[PDB]
Amino acid sequence: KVTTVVATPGQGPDRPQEVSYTDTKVIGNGSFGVVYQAKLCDSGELVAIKKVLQDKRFKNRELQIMRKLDHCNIVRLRYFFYSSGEKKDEVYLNLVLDYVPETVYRVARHYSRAKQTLPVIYVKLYMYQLFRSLAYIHSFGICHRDIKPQNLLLDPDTAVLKLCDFGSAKQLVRGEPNVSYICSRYYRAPELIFGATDYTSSIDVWSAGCVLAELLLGQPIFPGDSGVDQLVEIIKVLGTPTREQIREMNPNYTEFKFPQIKAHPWTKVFRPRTPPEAIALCSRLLEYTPTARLTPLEACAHSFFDELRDPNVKLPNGRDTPALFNFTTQELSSNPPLATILIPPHAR
Amino acid sequence: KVTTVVATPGQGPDRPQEVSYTDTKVIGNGSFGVVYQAKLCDSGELVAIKKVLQDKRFKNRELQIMRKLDHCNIVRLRYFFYSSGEKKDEVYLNLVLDYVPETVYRVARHYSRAKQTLPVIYVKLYMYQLFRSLAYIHSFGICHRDIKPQNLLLDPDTAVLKLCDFGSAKQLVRGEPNVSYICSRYYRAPELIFGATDYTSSIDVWSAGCVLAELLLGQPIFPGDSGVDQLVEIIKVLGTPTREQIREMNPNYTEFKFPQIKAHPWTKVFRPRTPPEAIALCSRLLEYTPTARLTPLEACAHSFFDELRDPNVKLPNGRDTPALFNFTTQELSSNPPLATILIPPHAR
Ligand SMILES: N#C[C@@H](Cc1nc2nc(NC3CCCCC3)nc(N)n2n1)C(N)=O
Ligand SMILES: N#C[C@@H](Cc1nc2nc(NC3CCCCC3)nc(N)n2n1)C(N)=O
Ligand SMILES: [Cl-]
Ligand SMILES: [Cl-]
Ligand code: NA
Numbered sequence A, B: 001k002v003t004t005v006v007a008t009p010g011q012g013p014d015r016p017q018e019v020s021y022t023d024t025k026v027i028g029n030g031s032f033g034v035v036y037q038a039k040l041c042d043s044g045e046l047v048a049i050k051k052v053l054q055d056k057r058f059k060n061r062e063l064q065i066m067r068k069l070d071h072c073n074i075v076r077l078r079y080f081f082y083s084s085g086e087k088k089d090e091v092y093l094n095l096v097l098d099y100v101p102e103t104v105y106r107v108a109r110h111y112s113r114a115k116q117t118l119p120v121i122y123v124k125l126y127m128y129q130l131f132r133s134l135a136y137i138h139s140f141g142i143c144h145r146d147i148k149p150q151n152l153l154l155d156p157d158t159a160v161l162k163l164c165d166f167g168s169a170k171q172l173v174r175g176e177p178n179v180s181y182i183c184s185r186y187y188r189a190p191e192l193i194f195g196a197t198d199y200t201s202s203i204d205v206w207s208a209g210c211v212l213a214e215l216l217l218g219q220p221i222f223p224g225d226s227g228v229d230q231l232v233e234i235i236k237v238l239g240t241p242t243r244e245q246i247r248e249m250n251p252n253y254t255e256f257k258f259p260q261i262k263a264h265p266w267t268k269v270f271r272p273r274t275p276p277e278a279i280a281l282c283s284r285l286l287e288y289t290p291t292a293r294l295t296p297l298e299a300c301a302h303s304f305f306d307e308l309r310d311p312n313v314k315l316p317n318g319r320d321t322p323a324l325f326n327f328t329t330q331e332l333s334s335n336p337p338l339a340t341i342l343i344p345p346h347a348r
Helices: A061-066 A104-113 A120-139 A202-217 A227-238 A243-249 A276-285 A296-300 A303-309 A336-342 B061-068 B104-113 B120-139 B202-217 B227-238 B243-249 B276-285 B296-301 B303-309 B336-342
Strands: A002-009 A017-028 A033-040 A046-053 A077-083 A092-098 A152-155 A160-163 B003-009 B017-029 B033-040 B046-053 B077-083 B092-098 B152-154 B161-163
Touching (some): A002 A092, A104 A152, A120 A152, A120 A202, A202 A276, A202 A296, A276 A303, A296 A336, B003 B092, B061 B092, B104 B152, B120 B152, B120 B202, B120 B303, B202 B276, B202 B296, B276 B296, B296 B336
Antiparallel strands (some): A002 A017, A033 A046, A077 A092, A152 A160, B003 B017, B033 B046, B046 B092, B077 B092
């Protein structure tokens, strides 16, 4: 009922601490392992405890990444500790994360059952914060590789979004291959569908574009149970990829024949009330050619998010906007001059 | 109510004729298009009509393949015709197939939802016929590439199984590249998960192995929404692949690290009392090394199907089994001496 473990502070001094927690229950299963909710005894603060198999023979990459990340739009690591668990003779890594009450997946499914779509102000807020989180991790060469609604945590009251799951995350290095089989069905970049191993951080931009399109639409834009089926849905919207485009995605694939279809114009993909700036942003995210896609920071600076930089912007609930403009040098490092757009006059 | 088209027979002279049908209704969707049931006015016979967009550029390969195939365990293409459809000025190919009332998918789910398993006699009947269809197409060098319960049709009362959807099927040629992104989630050989463009007909055997497993087990054996999750599940059963096994699947993956995990003995994967020869056949289909997997024809000859060769065997409904032993020469061509096992005494 009250459990006590010795744990290391996620960030801060490397000094072990006694940590007591109660009201423990399973909130999720998965290929990774188990997620638990619990309450810290000292503070009363809720946490989420992600428990995963530890590879006995090399240090855990997820832990390593999560210990260097510090950002308002990434879920915080409070503590970690090793333990035994279900399977015999295994050591488990336990990541003690700040609890967050909702996910983008769950909110999006709430409006879908009400035959409604998320109000656009929320879509700007959440997508803006996702892009800021990607700008941050990308500035360290870290690619998330599994951007999807389930991994986007929301606090509905504050409209703050936090990026979870660094279980697939990896620092990408040019000339060093990467497994092609990361990323979840609907959110996978074409280069990944094509089994590329030399892909870039722009795979997260594609994933992010799929999420935005999906919030606008009320359903996934590129569904399918096979790669073929996904490609067809992609080709239906984007049109047939040229050979030049294919060579940039996976050069092994340039001589394959593809379904011959004309690009279905973007304005008719989305609902009539969809804002045209949103449609423009989707088109600049969901590009075949990886380097033609907006960077996260450029995405942040897109006109769709202008309403966020309006000093007179309020949320529906009445509350002010969360922190959107406290950008660090690290965050801006890919394109410092973009600060002139991203940090509006009323915040300098 | 009555629709009249000009259609060409699936087989025989390219002689377009008037074909009238009625009692038209939708029984399916997909990336491909839509599926209809209908009734042929002349004969009263039921058909399914697969409607798909046509490429005025290049020939339809699905059509080409289905015109050539003649086999008791492959759905017969009765007619094809061109039409107007969804997109305004676009040409649709309509494949008119023999109606079959059920699928393995539906049957398996019926049982699944009731927390029961298919009786093994039915697992024998269906999997044997599946392997027979595979031996036949493979003998022409044609790989299906999308084996899964939804593509397996059956008549409940005769117990006959027929293999549908040749939309992904291709004649494979060694050393010539193929798209890796075919085959539906759960049924995909690990070489496809690794994005191999170089692969063989043995991907169908892996898939078939996944169907056998799924019917014994009551759920898919390697679920997951990412390739990584699929692979975790695979390794938990098969154990970590050796460097050599990896090289046989995709040599570009040899230098990546994999979870160090011990094989789960195969007997403890399935519920107790699961026939041991069902388990043995599974272990010879679901092999990392693609060349180590049984051929379809070897699969048919496996002891798991001995009961089918019994002169006294009957279906549960009391009728005789369908025709299981009337092999052609083409069918036996991969390994003709296997006829000794495959055609039992009472059938010669
Ligand atoms: N575990 C885990 C996720 C990240 C995650 N998921 C969370 N869910 C929550 N809360 C849930 C929101 C969904 C509704 C029930 C609790 N809180 C946190 N910190 N995380 N963090 C992963 N796969 O890495
Ligand atoms: N079209 C199509 C499927 C094959 C297919 N599916 C069928 N379903 C039926 N009948 C349904 C099966 C069970 C559900 C009711 C009707 N009949 C036929 N001939 N086919 N043929 C494909 N993806 O190519
Ligand atoms: Cl035959
Ligand atoms: Cl049945
Ligand atoms: Na090979």
